[PDB]
Amino acid sequence: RPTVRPRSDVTHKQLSAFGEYVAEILPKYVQQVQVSCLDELEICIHPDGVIPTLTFLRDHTNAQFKSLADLTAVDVPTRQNRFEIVYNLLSLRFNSRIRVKTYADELTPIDSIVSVHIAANWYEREVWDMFGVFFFNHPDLRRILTDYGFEGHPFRKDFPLTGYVELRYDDEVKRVVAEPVELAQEFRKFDLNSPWEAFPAYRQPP
Amino acid sequence: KVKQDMPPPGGYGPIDYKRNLPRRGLSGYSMFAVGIGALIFGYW
Amino acid sequence: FFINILTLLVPILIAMAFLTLVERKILGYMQLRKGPNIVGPYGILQPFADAMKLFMKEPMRPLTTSMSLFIIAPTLSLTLALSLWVPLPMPHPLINLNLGILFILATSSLSVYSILWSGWASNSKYSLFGALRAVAQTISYEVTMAIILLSVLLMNGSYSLQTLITTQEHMWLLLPAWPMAMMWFISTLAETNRAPFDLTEGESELVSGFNVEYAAGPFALFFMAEYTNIILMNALTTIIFLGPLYYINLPELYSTNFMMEALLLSSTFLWIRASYPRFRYDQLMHLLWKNFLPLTLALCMWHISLPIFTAGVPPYM
Amino acid sequence: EKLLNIQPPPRAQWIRVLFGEITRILNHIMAVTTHALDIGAMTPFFWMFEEREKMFEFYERVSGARMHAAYIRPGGVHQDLPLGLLDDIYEFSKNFSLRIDEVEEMLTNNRIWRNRTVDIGVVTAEDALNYGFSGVMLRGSGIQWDLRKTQPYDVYDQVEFDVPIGSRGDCYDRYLCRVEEMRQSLRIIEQCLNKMPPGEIKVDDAKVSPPKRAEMKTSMESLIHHFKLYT
Amino acid sequence: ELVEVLKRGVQQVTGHGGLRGLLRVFFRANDIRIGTLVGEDKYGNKYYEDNKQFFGRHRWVIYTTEMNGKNTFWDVDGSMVPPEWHRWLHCMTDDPPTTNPPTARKFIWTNHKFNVSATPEQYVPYSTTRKKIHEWVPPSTPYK
Amino acid sequence: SATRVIQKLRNWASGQDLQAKLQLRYQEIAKRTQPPPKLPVGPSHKLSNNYYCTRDGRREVVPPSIIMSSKKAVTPAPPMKRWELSKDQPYL
Amino acid sequence: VKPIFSRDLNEAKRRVRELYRAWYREVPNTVHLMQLDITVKQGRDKVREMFMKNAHVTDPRVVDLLVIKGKMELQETIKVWKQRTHVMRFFHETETPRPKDFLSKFYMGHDP
Amino acid sequence: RAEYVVTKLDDLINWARRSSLWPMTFGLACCAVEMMHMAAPRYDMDRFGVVFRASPRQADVMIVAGTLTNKMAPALRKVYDQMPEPRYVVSMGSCANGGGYYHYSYSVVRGCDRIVPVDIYVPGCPPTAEALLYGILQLQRKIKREQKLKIWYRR
Amino acid sequence: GVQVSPSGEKITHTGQVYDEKDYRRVRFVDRQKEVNENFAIDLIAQQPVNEVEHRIIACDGGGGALGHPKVYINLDKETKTGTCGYCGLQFKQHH
Amino acid sequence: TYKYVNKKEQESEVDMKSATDNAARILMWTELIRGLGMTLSYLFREPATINYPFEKGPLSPRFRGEHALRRYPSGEERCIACKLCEAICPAQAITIEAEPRADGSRRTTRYDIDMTKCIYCGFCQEACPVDAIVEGPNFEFSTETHEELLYNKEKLLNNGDKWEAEIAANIQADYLYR
Amino acid sequence: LHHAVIPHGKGGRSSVSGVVATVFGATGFLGRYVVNHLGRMGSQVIIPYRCDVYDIMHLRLMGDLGQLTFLEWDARDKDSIRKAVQHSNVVINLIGREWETRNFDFEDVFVNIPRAIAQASKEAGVERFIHVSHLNASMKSSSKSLRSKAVGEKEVRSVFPEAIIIRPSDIFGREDRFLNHFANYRWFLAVPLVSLGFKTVKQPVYVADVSKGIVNATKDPDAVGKTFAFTGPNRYLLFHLVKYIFGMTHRTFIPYPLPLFVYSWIGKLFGLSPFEPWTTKDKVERIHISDVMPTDLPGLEDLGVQPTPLELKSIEVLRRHRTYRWLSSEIEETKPAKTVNY
Ligand SMILES: NC(=O)C1=CN([C@@H]2O[C@H](COP(=O)(O)OP(=O)(O)OC[C@H]3O[C@@H](n4cnc5c(N)ncnc54)[C@H](OP(=O)(O)O)[C@@H]3O)[C@@H](O)[C@H]2O)C=CC1
Ligand code: SF4
Ligand code: SF4
Ligand code: SF4
Ligand SMILES: [Zn+2]
């Protein structure tokens, strides 16, 4: 079958054995282990779990996940804790990748991994500007990617796409001034969700 | 018959990719013997 | 005499404007461009239009600047750059100084004073950086350059400039003094701020250096002074080191040979600009005090010993 | 295509690897010569941006735009090569290595660039992995890692090439790693023009790639998959 | 061979229609070079091809003196070329309309309007729709 | 191109031959007009034995395999080997 | 709920008053050094008005996160990272406020 | 006749500005590469006499390239206000024209027309280097056809 | 046919015209409003009807893959010109 | 397969000939003379520039440029109000509000193409089922004011009427590729 | 109203206010501030420009897409007035020249040009006509400009009965001929003042308040036919005014007592430059004038915006004249001018 990408089960069974090993070594401190299809292992841990699970994955002999790829919230508003903060690790010896999830809202923060991974020293500033997720023990946590005075973390799903503040030059103050936003053309939002069941195995129970 | 974009039969030619640098100038002893010998006739 | 002032001062302005034209054309042909072809017959009316754009644009009067040094630095910069040409030899000079090499050295440092007053009284942090790397650049070049001029005028016993052509009548001074010649060409690149040794104009680490806040008008008149210094020290290297054959019956033949040699030297200057990458203010000072100053002190030693070893004591005139 | 679990055809995989190494030559040439513009060597930017304009003409022949191409679609590429593009790729690939030799003839072995770029920004390899450096930032410091060699995406396990790694972690070693990666990119260009396979350009799953334009006017299911794959 | 390239320079000086044609090509195109004439269009452009030069330099134009009642001596722009010769000049085909003409349709424009910004001939945009909300007009008579 | 004196000066000053390899396309580019090619069929352009229910990739993906939710030492792979030196160029 | 650095409302108000202390030291150096336009009393009144805008809340979690946001604005105004225009965006002098009475809100548009 | 002398002095003062106009070593975008490609020797700036200076006091025309975000807006208006008084603005590309992508974003100023006057809108995501070299030809003929000393005379 | 308003404005072929008291006409002074001479409504009346023998015709607009998709038009009602909804070339039965 | 790029530091007993070669590489800077010879070799070349108002650029038949509405070979504007070309236009730059024409056919009242928006990507010309929208290979359509790059319908229609002699040749030479 | 002049919007850039104003003389200073405050609320303004497109180029940012129609015009030709007025509903008239040229005198630019603009306005039937004059316009003023402006008011009332004649005082702003005219006296190292500022008294009035008042006069339905005396904030004597200007600039302040005849001679032989002059004789006799307190005439507060004082906004406008020694001196480091009641 040339259309479908071929599936090798050897990486799935060794990632199942390694996810069994990480859930064995941290029983207080790992909630869920998901060895997905496309052969990626996701380890979902506590908001308190992040510093010793990532210290374990950085400094363990079989793990050796020294390089952190990205620190990323996704914002699902239908959960009690909206932001899935993920940490993508990378083994420089064992050639694999852990996608560590943890949960947060804006009011229960996570201890930051700057004390173990100095890769994430800008990723914490990126996710705190981007999602409103505060992090502890940081050297200088700061909004960096939005403006100097952009009130509102933009990548939350409660934030609109257009924004709130537009800018315009004014000759009255002889400076660039902020205005409440109004658009020449609106964002023509579509409804591209087809009403039929796309995937029969991925169906929620009623 | 299809007319797809293919390499020709016999393949393409060899592509140079190694670093080829010429050894221009001359030997450093005789190049110094030119320049020190330029001083002697000039001082004379 | 004033006819000689006007007919030496006008065509040196035409010559440095065409030096900026052949800078853009020679860097273009080095860089596989064609250069400013579209205005003039082959480019000739581009720098006249550059002066006629940059002088009919206005300058700033900034609050942060000091206005007296803001208006008194570039009038100095054009005066000193056009006044180093008046002891230059040609066949027979416009003004024959008794000792003109010291005038060239001191007023060439006074051009850096015009640059340095621009750097302080321009009153930016970028301009203050440009002023202090002017200070560090002259810290690199000045002692080395005067030791070079001293150690070649141990072969020509006076500081006069006509004595250089009556010394260099028989042979060039490139052939006895090529370790002087390579480091003098490097040191006058450091003098006139060209693209290996161009810091203080910057353009690739900082924004403009001495003319950050200097708008059109005074930036153009600094540009006038800078390329006047380029063609000036090109002609000074041409007269002092590869000085051509001098015939007293035919001075115009020697002037044509001197101008073919000076366009070769200016093409070598812009060729060096479009051949080498740029220095640093630390490494510039480092090798001009490390790989130059023991070597030019030893060349000072050897040319001190040269009226003793081979017994050529130079005459006074 | 991984999320849809869709393999592209091997012609799509080799044109992906071929234009990804044209893309690698593009970014390495802009990287080294714009870093030369940041140093002060203005001239390799001009002499290599002529070749970058030639490869932008290759981009414009294969897709239509100079830069913002939008050509590598999910499920194979959008359109085919124009007829006789690969002869021009071979004619450019003959002459580009002399330009690489000329730029490193001016810039690698000389005192000014060598003194400006040796022992500058010396990164420890363990501090580089702690800071999350990747690719040429790792290969300057000498830790052996290249995603076309250790986790082979597309058809990069079929081609054989060399990974340039440094031994002192500096600016000069990173520039030499980029120039040697251009030369090994030329080797992947030679291998792609040796073993480019026949086939089709997008995937033949009509629910993943859009269908062909000749079959869209004639067949109804191609019009459904065209319509509901494009809205 | 240096006298052969000097004869080439003398030939391209003397080939561009005398001294007046030499000076107008020298001060319009700023490139004195001669090739064969592949075709003159309806406006007055003279198209030239010389295949011994580069890919890109081999196809060039000499523009009009008049275009739509405008003096175009020193004022020459990009969109003066006709669209049927645009494909030849930008190297999208190897066939000029003198050799292979395009298809002519009854609605097509017989003269190329050039690029026309900051002119009284000018595109300005508008709605291309009717009045969607029709108003209620008052009656012309009073209530009593 | 230029004549033989400037060509020999260019070849000496670069250090190698330059008339063999140009960055300027004279005739090495082929004809810009082309014969119209024929795009071939795919491996799913079949009249017979061609089903999306066998050819699908969008429905062979299941929900992810949850291992643990609420024996010797385990590695995520075999530990990878270092690469070899290149036979074309060991050093530089 | 696991709290952020201020445990209770008294310690949260203590860190609020420390941040207001740092803003009250911060404003005259900002007006003198930014080549600003505003009166320094107008700047301190705008700081007090921006505190009274958000001072109707109870929860020490959101009070401590407002302390974190105010410390970010504090360090972006001490280290000169917020400019003249970025400081003056808080005043909104390009735009009259929307009318609080019903009749002008009826007149000016469809605003509820 | 004095109006002929005034219009010929207007052409002589606009010929210098149409020929030797000096742009800006700008950046910011995808569109930074195509300014470098107009510097590149296929479609060339410097053949026209169009020189990338870095300083705003020495620049004569500003090529705004690509996206102009909300943080970049005082970092564009400060630079344009420190350009000296013949100030022409090219907007390279659709993100400087009206926000090509990111029109509906939270942090793009929707075109360069919101901040500075732009004298020529050059469209594309690539404007090709020949396409805004046409754009510099059209600004060149625009400030050729402007009349400054003529309306100084009749006033 | 390009019609003219009492204000002199060309009527756009969709039927758009600006009113005499409208303030949106002030973009048209010292400029011009673009209207094409070849009206798409009037450029189908010059097309002749196609007398064909087929009960069901197939149309593609000419060229195959150049034009519209190959759709099928009924011709049973002889009093009505059986049109192609993509294009508008009128077809009619031979008998 | 890895490969070292800078690894030669070894005391390999440097003799008199190689030591004078290194001491003549320094103190004459003959590799800077070598770089001077490299730039001397490049200054004697006929350059790669073209003179663009008289010598125009190399392009492609697939070069996507100014947007244009095409027409059928026997009159009759090709656009049929499908609205899949703004569901694919990723800038959301196309408004095409339409009506029945009161002639039995199906056309558009409004087109809008925003040239100060839009991505110049060829998504619309690959989504157009009749090839009505096309991207004709202009690039000389730079305007001076912001109004003139908001192409509604009439500018688009006489643009395609202006450029139908070249666009139809490009589609006739290109329609086997797509 | 029409179907597109109806104000569906929220008063910003892309919002429609329906205030279709032909702003005659919009190229300068009061025009740039009122075109800013007109496109701030959002409208299609019509700008007739006499000068080049480059000196009106900085007005292109002052509204939304296609909301500013720049039409060139000559003052003599009636068709140039007609094609700019005839599609509008409100015409603002800010035609002003404080000096004289060869083609335009002191009197014709304030009489015959608003005569032609209001004649085309009454021919085209626009609603409101915001003619701006000076509030010291009379028949017995010593300067010729106020004598021209009073009979220009008389002729614009003769040809337009419902014309809103807004009468500002000396308008102060960022590029004005009042504050920079008083603060550019430092190059002569003395201020030659008319009777040492002891017989003349002024009310400087802010340009955003004048432009906000003109915008609210266009939007005010009951203000048609009025004559707005437009003096606002606190009344300063001229000695304390130039003392406030030079104490905020921190330059050398030596007020030279020179009489009106010799100082008008200084202005007469100073205004002979063929460019825009530094001072003129009618500018000198407008410095020596007393703006009276208006009796039963409406102003800022009944129109809807309060006048900002000179002390609140003088650091906006006097920063372009200081040195670096006293550049960062704020409001409280200088002394305010003394406020008189007469
Ligand atoms: N100092 C001040 O600003 C004060 C002004 N006023 C009044 O305010 C109004 C506007 O003032 P302000 O903006 O400062 O004045 P300006 O000096 O800036 O000029 C106002 C406008 O008038 C135009 N204009 C001048 N002469 C002519 C003419 N002959 N034909 C056509 N247009 C012409 C100018 O256009 P162009 O660019 O072509 O010259 C400009 O747009 C005037 O009525 C003035 O009397 C009252 C008190 C103080
Ligand atoms: S206009 Fe297009 S190419 Fe330029 S920055 Fe925007 S997306 Fe990139
Ligand atoms: S897809 Fe083509 S025919 Fe359909 S609405 Fe768009 S432009 Fe018109
Ligand atoms: S080219 Fe892409 S961006 Fe432009 S109209 Fe087509 S879909 Fe939109
Ligand atoms: Zn049909």
Curated annotation (Swiss-Prot), chain D:
Phenotype on disruption: Knockout mice show early perinatal death and major defects in the CNS, compromising especially the postnatal development of dorsal cortex, corpus callosum, hippocampus and cerebellum. Neonatal neurogenesis and gliogenesis are deeply impaired.
Domain of life: Eukaryota
Cellular localization per UniProt: Mitochondrion inner membrane
Binding-site list for [4Fe-4S] cluster: C171, C177, C192
Family membership noted in the UniProt record: Belongs to the complex I 49 kDa subunit family.
Subunit structure: Core subunit of respiratory chain NADH dehydrogenase (Complex I) which is composed of 45 different subunits. Component of the iron-sulfur (IP) fragment of the enzyme. Interacts with NDUFAF3. Interacts with NDUFAF7. Interacts with CERS2.
Role noted for this protein: Core subunit of the mitochondrial membrane respiratory chain NADH dehydrogenase (Complex I) which catalyzes electron transfer from NADH through the respiratory chain, using ubiquinone as an electron acceptor. Essential for the catalytic activity and assembly of complex I. Redox-sensitive, critical component of the oxygen-sensing pathway in the pulmonary vasculature which plays a key role in acute pulmonary oxygen-sensing and hypoxic pulmonary vasoconstriction. Plays an important role in carotid body sensing of hypoxia.
Protein name, entry field: NADH dehydrogenase [ubiquinone] iron-sulfur protein 2, mitochondrial
Species: Mus musculus
Curated annotation (Swiss-Prot), chain G:
Domain of life according to the entry: Eukaryota
Location(s), subcellular: Mitochondrion inner membrane
Origin organism lineage: Eukaryota, Metazoa, Chordata, Craniata, Vertebrata
Summary of subunit composition and partner proteins: Mammalian complex I is composed of 45 different subunits.
CDD domains: Complex1_LYR_NDUFA6_LYRM6
Family, as annotated: Belongs to the complex I LYR family.
Cited function: Accessory subunit of the mitochondrial membrane respiratory chain NADH dehydrogenase (Complex I), that is believed to be not involved in catalysis. Required for proper complex I assembly. Complex I functions in the transfer of electrons from NADH to the respiratory chain. The immediate electron acceptor for the enzyme is believed to be ubiquinone.
Topology relative to the membrane: Peripheral membrane protein
Organism this protein belongs to: Mus musculus (Mouse)
Transmembrane segments: none
One Gene Ontology term, aspect cellular component: mitochondrial inner membrane
Name of the protein in its database record: NADH dehydrogenase [ubiquinone] 1 alpha subcomplex subunit 6
Keyword Signal: no
Primary site of residence: mitochondrion
Keywords: Electron transport, Membrane, Mitochondrion, Mitochondrion inner membrane, Respiratory chain, Transport
InterPro entries (UniProt xref): Complex1_LYR_NDUFA6_LYRM6, NADH_Ub_cplx-1_asu_su-6
Gene: Ndufa6
Curated annotation (Swiss-Prot), chain H:
GO biological process entries: aerobic respiration; mitochondrial electron transport, NADH to ubiquinone; mitochondrial respiratory chain complex I assembly; proton motive force-driven mitochondrial ATP synthesis
General function of this protein: Core subunit of the mitochondrial membrane respiratory chain NADH dehydrogenase (Complex I) which catalyzes electron transfer from NADH through the respiratory chain, using ubiquinone as an electron acceptor. Essential for the catalytic activity of complex I.
Membership in a protein family: Belongs to the complex I 20 kDa subunit family.
Main localisation: mitochondrion
Gene Ontology terms: cellular component: mitochondrial inner membrane; mitochondrion; respiratory chain complex I
EC number(s) on file: 7.1.1.2
Organism: Mus musculus (Mouse)
The name this protein goes by in its record: NADH dehydrogenase [ubiquinone] iron-sulfur protein 7, mitochondrial
Residues of the full protein shown: 70 to 224 of 224
Cofactor names: [4Fe-4S] cluster
From Swiss-Prot, chain K:
Modified residues (N6-succinyllysine): K140
Main location: mitochondrion
Pfam families in alphabetical order: NmrA
CDD domains: NDUFA9_like_SDR_a
Record has Signal as a keyword: no
BP GO annotations: aerobic respiration; circadian rhythm; proton motive force-driven mitochondrial ATP synthesis
Cell compartments where the protein resides: Mitochondrion matrix
Superkingdom per UniProt: Eukaryota
Cofactor comment text: Binds 1 FAD per subunit.
Disulfide bonds listed in the record: none
GO cellular component: mitochondrial inner membrane; mitochondrial matrix; mitochondrion; respiratory chain complex I
Residues modified as N6-acetyllysine: K154, K335
UniProt keyword terms in alphabetical order: Acetylation, Electron transport, FAD, Flavoprotein, Mitochondrion, Respiratory chain, Transit peptide, Transport
MF-aspect GO terms: NADH dehydrogenase activity; protein-containing complex binding
The protein's role, per its UniProt record: Accessory subunit of the mitochondrial membrane respiratory chain NADH dehydrogenase (Complex I), that is believed not to be involved in catalysis. Complex I functions in the transfer of electrons from NADH to the respiratory chain. The immediate electron acceptor for the enzyme is believed to be ubiquinone.
Subunit and interaction comment: Complex I is composed of 45 different subunits. This a component of the hydrophobic protein fraction. Interacts with BLOC1S1. Interacts with SLC2A4. Interacts with CLOCK. Interacts with RAB5IF.
Protein name per the record: NADH dehydrogenase [ubiquinone] 1 alpha subcomplex subunit 9, mitochondrial
Organism of this sequence: Mus musculus (Mouse)
Gene this protein is translated from: Ndufa9
